[PDB]
Amino acid sequence: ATVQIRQKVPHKRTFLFLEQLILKHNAHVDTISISEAKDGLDFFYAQKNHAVKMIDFLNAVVPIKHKKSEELISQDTHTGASTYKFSYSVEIVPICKDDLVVLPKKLAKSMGNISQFVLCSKISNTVQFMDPTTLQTADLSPSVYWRAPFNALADVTQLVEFIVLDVDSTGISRGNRVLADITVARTSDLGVNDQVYYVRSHLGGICHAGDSVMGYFIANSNYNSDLFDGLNIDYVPDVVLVKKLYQR
Amino acid sequence: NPVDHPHGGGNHQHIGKASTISRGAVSGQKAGLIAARRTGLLRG
Amino acid sequence: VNVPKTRKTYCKGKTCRKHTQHKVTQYKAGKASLFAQGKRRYDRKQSGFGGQTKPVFHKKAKTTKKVVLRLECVKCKTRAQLTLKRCKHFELGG
Amino acid sequence: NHTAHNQTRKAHRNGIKKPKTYKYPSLKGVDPKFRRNHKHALHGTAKALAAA
RNA sequence: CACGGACCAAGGAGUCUAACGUCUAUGCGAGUGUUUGGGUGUAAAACCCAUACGCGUAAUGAAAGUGAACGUAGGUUGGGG
RNA sequence: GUCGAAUUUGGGUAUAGGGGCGAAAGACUAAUCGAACCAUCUAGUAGCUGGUUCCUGCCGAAGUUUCCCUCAGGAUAGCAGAAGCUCGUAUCAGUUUUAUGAGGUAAAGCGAAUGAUUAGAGGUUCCGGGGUCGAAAUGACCUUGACCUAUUCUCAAACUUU
RNA sequence: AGAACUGGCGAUGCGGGAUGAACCGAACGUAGAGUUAAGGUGCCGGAAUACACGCUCAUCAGACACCACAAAAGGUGUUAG
RNA sequence: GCCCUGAAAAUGGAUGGCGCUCAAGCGUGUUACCUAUACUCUACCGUCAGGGUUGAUAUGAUGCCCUGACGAGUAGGCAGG
RNA sequence: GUGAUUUCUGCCCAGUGCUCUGAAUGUCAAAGUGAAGAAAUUCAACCAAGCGCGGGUAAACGGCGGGAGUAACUAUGACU
RNA sequence: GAAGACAUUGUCAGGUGGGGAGUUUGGCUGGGGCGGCACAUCUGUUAAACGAUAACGCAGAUGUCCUAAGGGGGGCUCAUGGAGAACAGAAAUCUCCAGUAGAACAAAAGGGUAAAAGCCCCCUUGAUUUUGAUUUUCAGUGUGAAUACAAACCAUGAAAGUGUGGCCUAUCGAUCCUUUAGUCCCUCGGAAUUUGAGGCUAGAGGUGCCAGAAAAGUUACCACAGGGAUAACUGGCUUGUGGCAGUCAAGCGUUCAUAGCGACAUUGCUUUUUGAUUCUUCGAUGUCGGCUCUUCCUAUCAUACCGAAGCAGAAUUCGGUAA
Ligand SMILES: [Zn+2]
């Protein structure tokens, strides 16, 4: 038997987190070989049992969808019981950890009437989203994802960094985070221009005045996705901050 | 068999989906508990 | 990509017919009015029984758009349309 | 899946023919600045040899 | 050691129509087509016929529209007779 | 197997086809049931099987190109037949010679690239990346990242001068 | 399993390889006479139990290419060097 | 070089068979011979091509006559019956 | 739904269902209202159920896995 | 007696609605199914010295990036090595010498390039308008991309010149629909004006299954038309692997290379098995084992006769003829 782990994304971020945590959890006890592939890998096993054990391990940390197919090796008669070659297709959700997502309309209305223009916030057995403009959270299971799948709007490689010119912390806080009125300037714009951008970020306490932050920039971007073209363009912000670039 | 009932069919004898039907369900779906606010034994 | 907010291009205007100076902007599509002939015909075909009668395109594969620049001559206000390649980022060099 | 057997025999049954050259090839692909003048040169030569 | 056939007789399968393409025969020929109809009849035949209409004589443009001789209807190269 | 009953049975009567009835087998509904029978639409459609009826003469192939939800099929070009038409030995030709071009295969030479070199004496440059967490203020770990000087080995075999 | 060039079979009979779609010869109207190809000439079987020089005796010899199975390693068996 | 061993598979069997041992085996050479629908010559049929003949004889030239070459064929095309 | 009697029927309301005698505008059609216009029309406000939020329910569908630390060494079918 | 302009009923409108209805559920493929995209493309190699040439052959790549990384011009020489200079060393900055490209040219690979196509500096918008011809894939159709001019207008340079994007080879898209730009041109057909709509010429929004349908499963209750084009048992071919025979036999067997066994590698056989194709049967060749019964092979377990041993006898071993 073999399991074929795939993720249809260039930057295999959750895949790299998974191959990091497999050495912590030590799930590679029965691996015959580790073959590479186009965008995932293959684990090979001499029995169906550790294939099911590896899938049961992946289904506790990774949002997956898997099948099982078979090839008849040899039909051995006098018993009627042939032997088998089994192949499992473990496919990860293609939304990584800090990804700008435009959710479907009825899906966004289903999960708590969240805003349609969200970030991803945590990858686990389920996929967690986050509104940046209000501290609002939603959860999407892999089974509900794969009925009508969708891909992220902008990858983590589309991030451009900014300089935090002001933090106004006059927002409403949930746990571990706090809303703000952060005034940022892009560090290809300050030094030549003199203009800024106001955002209601969820990084209202993680970054102070002056430091470098990293986020998406919608105003210069050029998207082609029907979910984004259905959005009201008067309510999509210009900047979405995702993470602080802590220099050390 | 699945012609005869919403509960029918299968390789084991199980209902499969939730057996509390809705109140606004049509005639032919109402096979179970019709507008069940509670279910189950309370304490005994 | 980046483009300057102005460029000296050939103006096809009747009074100019020369290299004048154009202000460039990005072209955004119109509002897709409701009395277009293929909208009146579509509504008349959709009204009734029969369900969805026209195909609804689903299998999208592109991830960018072609950038169209609208160039307005400063002399005679005649406009032209250039097109660039597909890019993911596009701003104007103010 | 692209077997080129019998294709040369099929090509050589009805011959492989030359493109049959003529006098005065077409001036449709030549330089237009030359062709515009060659029109006037031919017209002037005809009008000269007409009244001779 | 693929499928049909035990044998015999009779029946049994590229037809007709509407609109067309190429080629051929015929009639007339910048015209052509009598037969919707009328007259007539030895009576579903044959014979005779007006007006229209179809195609052709002119194209081009989305359309409004415009609409084919500088010249022994042109010059050169071959060309049967 | 059961045999005094949830028993067996006659006659009457009710339920009719996407309907009935079912102590539930998709069972039964006139030898028909995972949707009865009869007539019509109907000579339903089939890129799929089978058949396709006289003789002789002359000429005679293709299983290949391109596109197709295309691979038991079409269109398209090719091969082939028929009708000819303009001419009358021209222009040509699956061929050779002469002159002049293009090639980089055989042969010929050739020596190095790191993984597999049996890696020695080891270097210790401590160069970070990636991921998780991180009111990121400060930063932790999962880690991986370099052998180092000469140089091994008979051809592994990369490549070109001709 | 997949290609390159040519020839062929498919579409093809005839002489030969006992027989065989593809090999050798040679492509076909109906006959007569002559000469040959590929293959053969003890007998079946048309044709030399021809001629010339050698080798081999096998208690499963060997005899028409495709072709219808054969190696490494031995034998002072025999012959030649 | 030849022969033997190495060389084992299941119905009874295959240089085609009988059989062959100074071969009817093997290597090589020289002749003679056998015979295909092939080559050569002749006759006839057909097809194609070229040419002659409306002197005017059966006004017909559809014919008649002279010469040469050729003839395989599935799917298929055409022609004469 | 389970299938006499005896004896039990544990822990989960996150998910999916069902339900509510909970908040009230977040979305919200047709009609109606207002504004611009010559008008066709366009825009805006309001906006019912439903959805979303909040609660209940497992003899409803169903589910019942792991890691670290507790000193000399061990981590308990213990405690964090 | 109750209810009362509310229910009811009629018509529109939103929610719910597998209870029911109609459908669909791509292709390639060493079977199908996963996986992959060999489905639109690019480089080297397969590929066998013009061109053409296949495989789910191999090594990679594309769906991007750039107002400069486009265009013109001017200066200059790169990687690397050596020799020197306070801190300064392996390795900061400066100077000289050698330096045919061993550097760089956005990105795969290949080609190309030295008063450059590289590195700096200056000026710019030829990344423009009009449509034709041509090359590649090719039907000599489309799409994409290039090539050389023509008529304009420009840029740069003292000038000759060069420039119609990127040094070259990839970097992308029809009809219908919507929308923009232009003559402000045509039409709304009884005649007008203004909105509105429809046209013409060029673009954009997209079909990546990339010459371009809008689409989930199951059937062990299944059905039809066919298929040995293709899996199923049997055979045919094949020997990787399964078995046995010889070949050199390191050593072990008490220093006893063979009375026996065991290395590396090595030649080869039989179909009596694992595998590989798909050739025969898909208008059916009845599918495991056992019972029954006959015959054949030898690669001999026993019996017969020999020979050889760390064979004294006894018992064993090994070998020969032998079915
Ligand atoms: Zn102007």
Side-chain angles (χ1 to χ4, degrees):
Chain A
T2 193
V3 304
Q4 317 150 322
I5 312 171
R6 293 305 187 270
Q7 193 185 350
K8 296 327 201 292
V9 152
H11 173 38
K12 33 177 69 175
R13 166 155 175 162
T14 61
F15 181 80
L16 273 196
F17 169 55
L18 162 74
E19 64 87 35
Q20 169 214 325
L21 74 93
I22 187 179
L23 297 177
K24 175 242 172 174
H25 274 269
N26 210 308
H28 49 282
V29 303
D30 297 357
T31 43
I32 297 179
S33 80
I34 299 145
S35 157
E36 311 265 20
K38 163 88 180 57
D39 46 5
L41 54 79
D42 311 71
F43 287 135
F44 289 88
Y45 292 126
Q47 74 273 22
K48 196 192 167 180
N49 311 114
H50 214 257
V52 188
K53 186 181 170 263
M54 193 43 182
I55 291 197
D56 281 4
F57 164 66
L58 292 205
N59 213 356
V61 281
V62 195
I64 67 172
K65 169 174 75 75
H66 61 281
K67 322 292 180 36
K68 173 183 96 168
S69 197
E70 59 188 0
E71 205 196 2
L72 208 76
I73 295 189
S74 52
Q75 174 45 83
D76 297 62
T77 181
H78 325 286
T79 306
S82 181
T83 183
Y84 40 81
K85 238 163 176 172
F86 278 139
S87 297
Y88 297 87
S89 298
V90 173
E91 165 96 8
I92 307 181
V93 168
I95 292 159
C96 294
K97 200 254 183 188
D98 270 327
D99 260 7
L100 193 72
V101 187
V102 180
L103 285 170
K105 179 187 170 47
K106 283 307 172 283
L107 185 73
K109 280 177 158 171
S110 156
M111 49 188 54
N113 212 305
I114 204 180
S115 172
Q116 213 172 346
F117 191 73
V118 288
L119 287 176
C120 203
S121 43
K122 196 170 83 172
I123 284 297
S124 45
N125 57 328
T126 174
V127 174
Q128 187 193 114
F129 291 104
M130 193 80 217
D131 201 33
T133 49
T134 81
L135 271 297
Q136 197 173 349
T137 321
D139 261 358
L140 172 80
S141 68
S143 65
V144 169
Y145 173 77
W146 283 111
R147 296 169 194 175
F150 53 93
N151 40 4
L153 193 73
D155 209 16
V156 200
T157 65
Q158 318 294 283
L159 288 180
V160 61
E161 64 165 330
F162 293 80
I163 297 310
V164 184
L165 260 68
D166 183 301
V167 175
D168 176 30
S169 298
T170 322
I172 309 97
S173 177
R174 216 189 271 188
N176 216 122
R177 273 145 160 190
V178 51
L179 203 58
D181 202 79
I182 300 187
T183 299
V184 290
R186 192 171 45 160
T187 170
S188 88
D189 267 319
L190 81 157
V192 51
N193 307 7
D194 57 328
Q195 57 100 23
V196 286
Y197 298 97
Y198 293 168
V199 294
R200 315 283 318 274
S201 159
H202 74 283
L203 301 191
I206 214 72
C207 56
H208 287 65
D211 46 33
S212 177
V213 77
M214 196 164 276
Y216 296 105
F217 194 28
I218 320 292
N220 72 335
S221 159
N222 177 252
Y223 290 127
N224 188 84
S225 89
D226 51 355
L227 302 158
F228 191 85
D229 310 328
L231 294 202
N232 189 17
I233 203 74
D234 298 334
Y235 289 150
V236 193
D238 293 8
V239 192
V240 177
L241 273 74
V242 308
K243 65 183 192 181
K244 193 201 153 147
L245 202 64
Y246 171 66
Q247 212 260 333
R248 188 78 269 159
Chain B
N1 289 277
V3 274
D4 308 342
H5 210 266
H7 296 182
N11 288 345
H12 298 258
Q13 294 210 330
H14 68 112
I15 307 188
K17 287 187 153 300
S19 87
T20 48
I21 322 291
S22 159
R23 167 65 80 201
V26 313
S27 300
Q29 309 184 326
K30 304 186 119 171
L33 321 166
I34 301 301
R37 324 188 174 87
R38 277 203 88 261
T39 33
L41 195 42
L42 194 145
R43 284 302 306 183
Chain C
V1 91
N2 244 268
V3 189
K5 305 202 119 169
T6 46
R7 55 180 287 180
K8 284 182 202 161
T9 320
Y10 180 89
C11 187
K12 297 184 62 197
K14 174 163 298 298
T15 171
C16 300
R17 259 155 210 177
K18 69 199 183 192
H19 261 79
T20 77
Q21 166 145 209
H22 298 73
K23 299 184 164 311
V24 319
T25 76
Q26 191 178 354
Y27 156 76
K28 314 169 197 309
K31 292 201 80 73
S33 70
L34 313 98
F35 305 114
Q37 178 49 70
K39 180 62 174 44
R40 317 195 295 259
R41 167 189 303 129
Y42 177 74
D43 288 339
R44 170 88 195 257
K45 191 184 200 70
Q46 284 294 136
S47 70
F49 300 107
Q52 184 69 229
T53 75
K54 289 290 264 280
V56 281
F57 174 72
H58 295 133
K59 318 184 65 50
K60 286 271 303 286
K62 302 267 175 299
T63 172
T64 41
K65 286 181 170 178
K66 278 173 183 166
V67 189
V68 193
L69 320 168
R70 208 191 59 159
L71 274 59
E72 179 152 27
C73 172
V74 300
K75 287 204 172 181
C76 74
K77 296 301 176 189
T78 309
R79 301 190 266 275
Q81 280 182 133
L82 264 76
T83 169
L84 322 172
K85 314 203 172 175
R86 309 190 188 259
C87 47
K88 303 194 165 189
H89 294 278
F90 166 71
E91 48 206 290
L92 277 304
Chain D
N1 323 103
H2 195 95
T3 296
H5 214 71
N6 200 73
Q7 302 315 298
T8 321
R9 162 166 285 274
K10 264 167 58 173
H12 275 100
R13 259 167 196 147
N14 258 330
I16 303 188
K17 303 298 181 176
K18 299 300 290 190
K20 196 198 183 310
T21 181
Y22 319 92
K23 200 166 189 163
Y24 302 126
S26 65
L27 294 195
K28 62 141 202 173
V30 302
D31 198 34
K33 200 200 292 189
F34 158 74
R35 200 255 302 149
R36 275 200 298 272
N37 166 65
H38 182 73
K39 162 174 63 199
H40 305 144
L42 285 190
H43 190 70
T45 314
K47 288 296 178 63
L49 272 72

